[PDB]
Design a protein around this ligand. Structure first.
Ligand SMILES: CC(C)c1cccc2c(-c3ccc(Cn4cncn4)cc3)c(C(=O)O)[nH]c12
Ligand code: NA
Ligand SMILES: [Zn+2]
Ligand SMILES: [Zn+2]
Length: 231
């Protein structure tokens, strides 16, 4: 659509005045060319990234796009679990000198997953909110661990000052026929974790997610319902 700017085999879509969705694609036998989404946030004179693309080369295109279209330094990136669609491009971020952050558990898992760990580890209070001293300079990004679901390590991100909350791999859209790739999922706890995400960001009306276009809060409801069926 008109909002879907094309650049370097990726797609960039403005969602709010200072927020864009990045989308990259990986062709895999049996799956088609699977889209994965992350975010780009301008916070004053700097840019913040949520999630890499599937590959280093694609993630380099995210950074090229930022330079062309925003032309401000990228201060940090936060990646939302140790799977290829979210952390496949860590080397590109590190080649740009960008400080990278992930759940401590994601950093522990990354090497066995064939991924490069983020430089910095986030830890979370018992109620799920990030311990702020582990998320220095996060600006409007509000990071929440909802519990195991799509993976054990999945985290979520709200953008303060906007209507947006990012569910990453945890949340699928209201028309989705399944929960996507459950290979590393916690099927017992998924429904509660999806609901915890919704309760952490109760003001959010635009739910952004890894594998479908932004949706209403019906994405959370429908995801939790599909997840309840797994119990
Ligand atoms: C583990 C990771 C590297 C990976 C590889 C290949 C596919 C996926 C998917 C995925 C699979 C199917 C669909 C189709 N679909 C659309 N809405 C509901 N299902 C969507 C995503 C996910 C995911 O679910 O995070 N991770 C993936
Ligand atoms: Na909220
Ligand atoms: Zn995943
Ligand atoms: Zn995914």
């Amino acid at each position: 659509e008109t909002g879907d700017q094309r650049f370097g085999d990726l797609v960039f879509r403005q969602l709010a005045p200072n927020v864009w969705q990045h989308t990259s694609y990986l062709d895999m036998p049996g799956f088609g060319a699977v889209a994965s989404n992350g975010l780009i946030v301008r916070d004053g004179g700097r840019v913040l990234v949520v999630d890499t693309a599937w590959t280093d080369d694609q993630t380099a295109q995210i950074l090229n796009w930022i330079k062309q279209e925003i032309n401000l330094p990228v201060a940090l990136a936060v990646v939302t679990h140790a799977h290829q669609d979210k952390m496949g491009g860590m080397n590109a971020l590190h080649a740009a000198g960008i400080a990278t952050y992930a759940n401590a558990l994601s950093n522990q898992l990354a090497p066995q997953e064939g991924l490069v760990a983020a430089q910095h580890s986030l830890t979370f209070a018992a109620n799920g909110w990030v311990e702020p001293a582990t998320a220095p300079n996060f600006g409007p990004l509000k990071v929440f661990y909802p519990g195991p679901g799509h993976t054990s390590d999945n985290i979520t991100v709200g953008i303060d000052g906007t209507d947006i909350a990012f569910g990453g791999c945890l949340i699928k859209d209201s028309k989705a026929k399944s929960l996507g790739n459950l290979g590393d999922a916690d099927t017992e706890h998924y429904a509660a974790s999806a609901r915890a995400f919704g309760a952490a960001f109760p003001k959010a009306s635009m739910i952004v997610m890894s594998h479908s276009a932004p949706d209403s809060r019906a994405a959370i409801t429908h995801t939790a319902r599909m997840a309840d069926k797994l119990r």
